[PDB]
Subunit: 119 residues, 4 copies
C-alpha cells in the first residue's frame, strides 16, 4: 500500500518504493516539478504492522542538496500510513538548517503534511 | 567527521557511516546494548556544507522493528553536526506510533537528543 | 476578531476574549462538553499586527485540572489567526505531562489543531 | 511551588514569575539586553495539585513579543515541567510562531528547548 506516488496539499510529490526489509527509497519533487526540483529520500517503515485498524509507522529524510542546488538543510517526516479508500500518509516534520552556534536556537522549523494518492 | 560511533545522553549508541552521495547508513542500539536491541537506520546529510562556521544539516529514521521485537513506531531525528574538538550532533526528534484514527491525535512524541563521540 | 467561540476538528470548543492589552482569557471545553470538561485558559496575542496581509500571532495554555479531575498535564498552542471569509486559527501544540526523571523523555506530545468559528 | 521567583536560561534570558494558588502563572520575561525595551508580559497555568510520587509539575506559559517599545509580530509558548529540590529546574520545549502570509505559513513555526534554573 505505501509504494507509489503521493501528493501533498502544496504541490509536492514523493515517489517511494517500500521494500520488504523495511526500507523506503524514492525521490521527492518540490512544487516546480523541475529536474532541479528533485531530491533523494530514504526512510524506514514498520513492515509487520498491527492488523487491527492501527496505522503503519514510518519516517523519511530529504537532505536539500542535489546536483543543481543546496539549501544546507535537512527535512525529516514522521508519521503513519492509513490505508483503505481514503488512503493517507499523515505526518509531522522537522526542518533543520545548518547554522552557526549563535543562531542554533533558531535552526529548526516544525510543521505537518498530509499526503494522498490523488491530487 | 560524521562517520563513527556516537552516544546520546541516555546510553543509546549511533553507529553511522556517512557516504559520498549524501547517504547515512548504520545501526542504532538502545541502552541495553545486546543483539535484540540493534536497529537499522537510514538517512541523509548535506555533503557540501557552507564554509562559514555553520553546522552540517542531517536527518535519519529508525523503525523500531527488528528480528526480535516490533514496537509499531518510528523515530526521526532532525539536526546538525558541529565539528572541531568536542564534535557534537544536536538533534530534535519525533516518535510516531501506529494508532487507530481515534487515537492519532496522541501518536507523536517530541524531544531532543545530543550526541557526542564520548560515552 | 479573535474574540468569540471557536471549534476544532475533534469536537472541542475554545471560548476566548481578546483584551486590549494583548491578553487572552477564557474557557476550553473538551469534546465531551459537560461541566467536568471545562478548563481555564490564559494566553497572549499581538494586539498590533502588520498590515501587509500577515497573520496575527498568539498562543495560550491550559493546565488539565478543574474541580472534577486532574490529568497532571498541560497543553500550549502556538499559532496565528488569519481573518478573511472563513476565519481560522492555525496552531501547533505541545502537551507536557508530569513525569519522573526516568520517564521525562516521553513527557511531551506534539500535534496541530485548526479552529474555525463554524462547528464541524 | 517552588515556582515563584526568578529563573535564568542559558542564553542570558530571565523570567520572573508568581504562581497563584488557583493555577495562575503571571510575570515578566526579559531577554538578554536587560532594559525596559527588553521586557515582556508572560501569562500561563500550572498544575496546582501535582502528584506526590516524585513526578514533575506540569506547566506552560506564553509570551507575545510586543511591549510598548517594539513589536516582532510573534509569540512563544513554553511547555514543560518544574522539578523541585536543591537543583530545581524547569525543563521545557517551546514553539515560536511568527505572523506570516498564507504563502509562507509552512515556515511560521520554530521549535526548540530551554532549561531554566534558579542560579545564573
Amino acid at each position: 500500500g505505501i509504494t507509489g506516488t503521493w501528493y501533498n496539499q502544496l504541490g509536492s510529490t514523493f515517489i517511494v518504493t517500500a521494500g520488504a526489509d523495511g526500507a523506503l527509497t524514492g525521490t521527492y519533487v518540490t512544487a516546480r516539478g523541475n529536474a532541479e526540483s528533485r531530491y533523494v529520500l530514504t526512510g524506514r517503515y514498520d513492515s509487520a504492522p498491527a492488523t487491527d485498524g492501527s496505522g503503519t509507522a514510518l519516517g523519511w529524510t530529504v537532505a536539500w542538496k542535489n546536483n543543481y542546488r543546496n539549501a544546507h538543510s535537512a527535512t525529516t517526516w514522521s508519521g503513519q500510513y492509513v490505508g483503505g479508500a481514503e488512503a493517507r500518509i499523515n505526518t509531522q516534520w522537522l526542518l533543520t538548517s545548518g547554522t552557526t552556534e549563535a543562531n542554533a536556537w533558531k535552526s529548526t522549523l516544525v510543521g505537518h503534511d498530509t499526503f494522498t494518492k490523488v491530487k
